[PDB]
Design an enzyme around this catalytic site. Structure first.
Site, PDB file in Angstrom:
ATOM      1  N   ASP A 207       0.820  -1.205   0.000  1.00  0.00           N
ATOM      2  CA  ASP A 207       0.000   0.000   0.000  1.00  0.00           C
ATOM      3  C   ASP A 207       0.860   1.264   0.000  1.00  0.00           C
ATOM      4  OD1 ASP A 207      -1.737  -2.054   0.364  1.00  0.00           O
ATOM      5  OD2 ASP A 207      -3.038  -0.903   1.660  1.00  0.00           O
TER       6      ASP A 207
ATOM      7  N   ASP B 137      -0.366  -2.651  -4.819  1.00  0.00           N
ATOM      8  CA  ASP B 137      -1.629  -2.673  -4.091  1.00  0.00           C
ATOM      9  C   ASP B 137      -2.291  -1.292  -4.070  1.00  0.00           C
ATOM     10  OD1 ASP B 137      -3.593  -3.142  -1.899  1.00  0.00           O
ATOM     11  OD2 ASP B 137      -2.525  -5.027  -1.876  1.00  0.00           O
ATOM     12  N   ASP B 138      -3.244  -1.135  -3.134  1.00  0.00           N
ATOM     13  CA  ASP B 138      -3.995   0.104  -3.034  1.00  0.00           C
ATOM     14  C   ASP B 138      -3.081   1.318  -3.060  1.00  0.00           C
ATOM     15  OD1 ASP B 138      -6.653  -0.320  -3.125  1.00  0.00           O
ATOM     16  OD2 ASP B 138      -6.769  -0.988  -1.067  1.00  0.00           O
TER      17      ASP B 138
ATOM     18  N   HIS C 164      -3.844  -0.827  -6.772  1.00  0.00           N
ATOM     19  CA  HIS C 164      -5.239  -1.242  -6.849  1.00  0.00           C
ATOM     20  C   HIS C 164      -6.168  -0.036  -6.994  1.00  0.00           C
ATOM     21  CE1 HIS C 164      -4.406  -5.396  -5.085  1.00  0.00           C
ATOM     22  NE2 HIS C 164      -3.903  -5.220  -6.309  1.00  0.00           N
TER      23      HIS C 164
ATOM     24  N   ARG D 174     -12.473   2.485  -5.940  1.00  0.00           N
ATOM     25  CA  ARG D 174     -13.079   1.345  -5.265  1.00  0.00           C
ATOM     26  C   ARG D 174     -13.460   1.675  -3.818  1.00  0.00           C
ATOM     27  NH1 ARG D 174      -9.741  -4.089  -3.935  1.00  0.00           N
ATOM     28  NH2 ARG D 174      -8.089  -2.646  -3.231  1.00  0.00           N
TER      29      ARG D 174
ATOM     30  N   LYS E 269     -14.841  -0.406  -0.590  1.00  0.00           N
ATOM     31  CA  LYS E 269     -15.153  -1.747  -0.114  1.00  0.00           C
ATOM     32  C   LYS E 269     -15.453  -1.754   1.387  1.00  0.00           C
ATOM     33  CE  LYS E 269     -10.167  -2.593   0.307  1.00  0.00           C
ATOM     34  NZ  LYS E 269      -9.264  -1.602  -0.274  1.00  0.00           N
TER      35      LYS E 269
END
Ligand SMILES: *[C@@H]1O[C@H](CO)[C@@H](O[C@@H]2O[C@H](CO)[C@@H](O)[C@H](O)[C@H]2NC(C)=O)[C@H](O)[C@H]1NC(C)=O
Ligand SMILES: CC(=O)N[C@@H]1[C@@H](O)[C@H](O)[C@@H](CO)O[C@H]1O
Length: 349
Positions: free
Chosen positions: A167, A188-189, A210, A243, A245
């Protein structure tokens, strides 16, 4: 000059004696954390040369910690901050049953007083890079997180990408945090906000990550997100662009979240993802309504997604979503029909 640190052994004294400290780029010995939690008020730390870290195979180890009021963490031209990721990566990332690696590279906690971190060249970090928590009125810009070296597989990941769960910016339990002009090459994010208020993320250059995602929210110490802004940003070669979540069976709050002026490019799965069925870092397919998502704005979200991804994916819980606004979006490219269940059973297509 006590304020000019040439070796780790001279850091402590510098932090207690100097308001202007200069790290000339040395290697932090194994098991020793670059402790900047005791920075004096109005203090400035400048990274020079190449700072490196010895190998510390421990998940709970935190290489760098930053704290203080109205402090400034910056770097000089050509400086470099290596996290020694190559020594950790085994393509499993934070997986519990994998090689031990520092979960949080840089922990920014208890930072207030209009503090700021700018013009930092960070590369090759273990797992998570920035762990911003318990901070307020903080500004981070001109940052360059490059973990492209972990994109290729090594002798420990087999066919997997050495780096994983890397991240870029993790934010939690913080207020009035601003991210501007930041480059992030990870796996990743790009930017993950599990909690906080009055958060601003603009001029972000995400790639291989991400995408700018919210959460996952719920099941954590803090499950309250209120007032987040993603502005003028670019997400390329990433799993998802925008995104949001939420953990399944968990409770929390996601209000006042706006994605404005976001350009997408070569998205793999989700152009815009909003689901509440995340369990153990994986989608379940059955969304819950424990986490209330309200006042979500998708303004001018354009770009293209790979044929293997869906333009839009909205999987809201049963009556846990409200106040969604869509204006000027133009996401195209998806080879799988978009699917969403709020506000109705149709999406921007
Ligand atoms: C915020 O911190 C800065 C330092 O980063 C303070 O400005 C320094 O302050 C002293 C005066 O006390 C001067 O000798 C230097 O020229 C200053 N540097 C800069 C960059 O301005 C500033 O006073 C702090 N603000 C508050 C509100 O305390
Ligand atoms: C030595 C010193 O000034 N310590 C302070 C404290 O007095 C003040 O409340 C705070 C915010 O202004 O910053 C620090």
């Amino acid at each position: 000059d006590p304020c000019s640190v040439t070796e780790y052994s001279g850091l402590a004294t510098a932090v207690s004696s100097c308001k202007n400290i200069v790290l000339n780029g040395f290697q932090v010995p194994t098991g020793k954390q670059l402790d900047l939690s005791s920075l004096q008020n109005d203090s400035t730390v400048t990274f020079k040369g190449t700072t490196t870290f010895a190998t510390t195979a421990d998940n709970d180890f935190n290489p760098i910690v930053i704290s203080g009021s109205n402090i400034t963490i910056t770097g000089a031209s050509g400086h470099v901050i290596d996290g020694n990721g190559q020594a950790y990566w085994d393509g499993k990332g934070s997986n519990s049953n994998s090689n031990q690696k520092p979960d949080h590279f840089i922990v920014v906690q208890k930072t207030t007083g209009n503090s700021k971190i700018t013009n930092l060249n960070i590369q090759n970090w273990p797992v998570h890079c920035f762990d911003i928590t318990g901070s307020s009125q903080l500004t981070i810009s001109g940052l360059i997180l490059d973990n492209r070296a972990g994109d290729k597989p090594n002798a420990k990941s087999g066919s997997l990408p050495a780096a994983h769960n890397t991240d870029g910016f993790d934010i939690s339990s913080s207020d009035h945090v601003t991210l501007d002009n930041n480059h992030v090459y990870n796996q990743d994010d790009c930017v993950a906000v599990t909690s906080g208020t009055n958060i601003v993320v603009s001029n972000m250059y995400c790639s291989g990550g991400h995408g700018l995602s919210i959460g996952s929210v719920g099941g954590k110490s803090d499950n309250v997100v209120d007032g987040v802004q993603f502005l003028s940003s670019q997400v390329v070669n990433s799993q998802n662009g925008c995104r949001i979540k939420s953990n399944s069976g968990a409770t929390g709050t996601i209000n006042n979240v706006t994605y404005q002026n976001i350009a997408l490019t070569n998205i793999s799965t989700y152009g815009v993802d909003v689901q509440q069925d995340y369990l153990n870092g994986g989608p379940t397919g059955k969304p819950t309504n424990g986490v209330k998502i309200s006042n979500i704005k998708f303004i001018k979200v354009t770009g293209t997604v790979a044929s293997s991804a869906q333009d839009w994916f909205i999987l809201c819980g049963d009556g846990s979503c409200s106040g969604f606004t869509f204006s000027g979006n133009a996401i195209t490219g998806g080879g799988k029909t978009s699917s969403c269940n709020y506000p109705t059973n149709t999406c921007p297509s």
